[PDB]
Amino acid sequence: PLDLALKRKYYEEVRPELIRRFGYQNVWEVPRLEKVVINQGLGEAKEDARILEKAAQELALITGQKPAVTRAKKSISNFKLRKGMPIGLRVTLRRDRMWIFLEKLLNVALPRIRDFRGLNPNSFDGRGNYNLGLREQLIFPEITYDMVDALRGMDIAVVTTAETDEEARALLELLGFPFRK
RNA sequence: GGGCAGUUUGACUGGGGCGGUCGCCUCCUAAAAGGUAACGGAGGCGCCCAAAGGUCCCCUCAGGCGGGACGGAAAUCCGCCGG
Ligand SMILES: [Mg+2]
Ligand SMILES: [Mg+2]
Ligand SMILES: [Mg+2]
Ligand SMILES: [Mg+2]
Ligand SMILES: [Mg+2]
Ligand SMILES: [Mg+2]
Ligand SMILES: [Mg+2]
Ligand SMILES: [Mg+2]
Ligand SMILES: [Mg+2]
Ligand SMILES: [Mg+2]
Ligand SMILES: [Mg+2]
Ligand SMILES: [Mg+2]
Ligand SMILES: [Mg+2]
Ligand SMILES: [Mg+2]
Ligand SMILES: [Mg+2]
Ligand SMILES: [Mg+2]
Ligand SMILES: [Mg+2]
Ligand SMILES: [Mg+2]
Ligand SMILES: [Mg+2]
Ligand SMILES: [Mg+2]
Numbered sequence: 001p002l003d004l005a006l007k008r009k010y011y012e013e014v015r016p017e018l019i020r021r022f023g024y025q026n027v028w029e030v031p032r033l034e035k036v037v038i039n040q041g042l043g044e045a046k047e048d049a050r051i052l053e054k055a056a057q058e059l060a061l062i063t064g065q066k067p068a069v070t071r072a073k074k075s076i077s078n079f080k081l082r083k084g085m086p087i088g089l090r091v092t093l094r095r096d097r098m099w100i101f102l103e104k105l106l107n108v109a110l111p112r113i114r115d116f117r118g119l120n121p122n123s124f125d126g127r128g129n130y131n132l133g134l135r136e137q138l139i140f141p142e143i144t145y146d147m148v149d150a151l152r153g154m155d156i157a158v159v160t161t162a163e164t165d166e167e168a169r170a171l172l173e174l175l176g177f178p179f180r181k
Numbered sequence: 182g183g184g185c186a187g188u189u190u191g192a193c194u195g196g197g198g199c200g201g202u203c204g205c206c207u208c209c210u211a212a213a214a215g216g217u218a219a220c221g222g223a224g225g226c227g228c229c230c231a232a233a234g235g236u237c238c239c240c241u242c243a244g245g246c247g248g249g250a251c252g253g254a255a256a257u258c259c260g261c262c263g264g
Contacts, residue, residue, distance in 0.1 A: 039258035041251055070257055081256060088257035125248035129260055133250035153250040157259040 006106075006175060007099040014174040022167060031128060031171050035159035036098045038063060039070070039090045040152060043079070046072075046086040055137075055152050059089055062140040063101055067091040089154075104141055105156075106176040113139050118180030121169070128162025130172060131155060 015030060024030045040059065045051040059067045068091060071084030093101055110116055114136070123131050133155040138148055162168035173179060 035259085037259060039249090041257050043256050044251060046256080072256060074256075076256065079252095079256075086256065090258060092258095123248060125246095125260060127247085127260055129248075131249040131259065135250050137250095155249050155258070157249075159259070 001100075002096055004096065004099050004103060006103045007096070009175060014171070017174055018167070018171060021170060028161075031160045031162035031167055033098060033102075033158060033160055033171075033175075034094060035157075036093045036101060037090065037157045037159075038067075038093070038154060039157075040088060040154035042087055042089065042152065043081070044152070046080065049087065051150065052087060054149060056089060058137065058143065058148070059091060059154075061142050062104075062137070063091050063093055064097050065091050065093050102158075102175070106178075108141055109134075109139050110178060116178075118178050121179045121181060124165035124168060126165060128160040128165045128168030128171075130158050130168070130177075 010032070018024070018030050022030075038059065040055060042052065042055060045055075056067050056069075067089045070088040070090045072081055072086035073084075075082035110119075113134075119130075119132055125131070133153065135153040136151050137143065137153055138145065138151065158172075160168050160171055162171060169179075
């Protein structure tokens with residue numbers, strides 16, 4: 001379904017807007033999203049995959065994609081780790097799914113967040129990319145209360161083509177990133 | 182069943198006994214081929230695997246810095262450097 005609200009926002013408003021502050025000589029120099037990634041540090045449930053099939057299908061609902069497990073590399077008995085028996089979930093959503101996802105998060109997820117106040121602006125890692133954590137996961141649409149057996153939040157990475165994050169700072173605000181400023 | 186009989190009771194060893202050692206692999210001694218001794222300096226083997234094998238196909242580390250709900254020097258995710 002190559003169409004949606006935010007998908008347009010970037011073109012018929014946000015694309016030229018960027019050219020206003022930086023004036024790119026070329027049509028591609030103008031930064032774009034192209035990679036949204038999500039990861040859950042469930043080393044907590046690394047014991048039994050029992051409490052894991054759930055957070056997977058839960059994650060799948062809110063993202064549309066079928067998540068992919070991530071094994072342990074090292075081994076640390078300091079907290080029950082060895083080989084690859086452990087666990088973590090990772091899902092790389094791009095294309096349309098990325099937009100239909102970012103619409104929910106910026107227009108539904110964030111606002112219903114317990115005592116929200118604005119995304120931390122410092123979370124820009126030199127190059128144009130943003131990261132942020134969420135203690136809960138029920139702050140998503142298609143998640144009912146009686147469904148969650150345990151509150152397990154996570155964090156999402158978003159990747160732009162922006163070289164410097166100075167530019168990136170702008171591209172996010174223009175899409176709908178409520179920065180704490 | 183030492184009353185009695187026939188015997189055995191290793192070698193190396195700055196004398197012998199005591200101690201230590203005895204076969205195999207790696208490194209140094211070894212003097213830029215090979216080989217090379219000392220009771221010279223240092224360490225391992227007496228197994229393991231039906232996947233830890235065959236072939237076809239695909240992927241590339243450790244580490245460092247920055248950013249990230251548990252995490253917290255170190256779990257998993259993203260970015261940059263890294264032969
Ligand atoms: Mg007898
Ligand atoms: Mg007798
Ligand atoms: Mg003498
Ligand atoms: Mg002697
Ligand atoms: Mg004597
Ligand atoms: Mg002796
Ligand atoms: Mg030994
Ligand atoms: Mg092997
Ligand atoms: Mg490759
Ligand atoms: Mg260090
Ligand atoms: Mg760091
Ligand atoms: Mg950090
Ligand atoms: Mg870090
Ligand atoms: Mg953190
Ligand atoms: Mg927790
Ligand atoms: Mg500590
Ligand atoms: Mg850290
Ligand atoms: Mg990385
Ligand atoms: Mg970077
Ligand atoms: Mg090399």
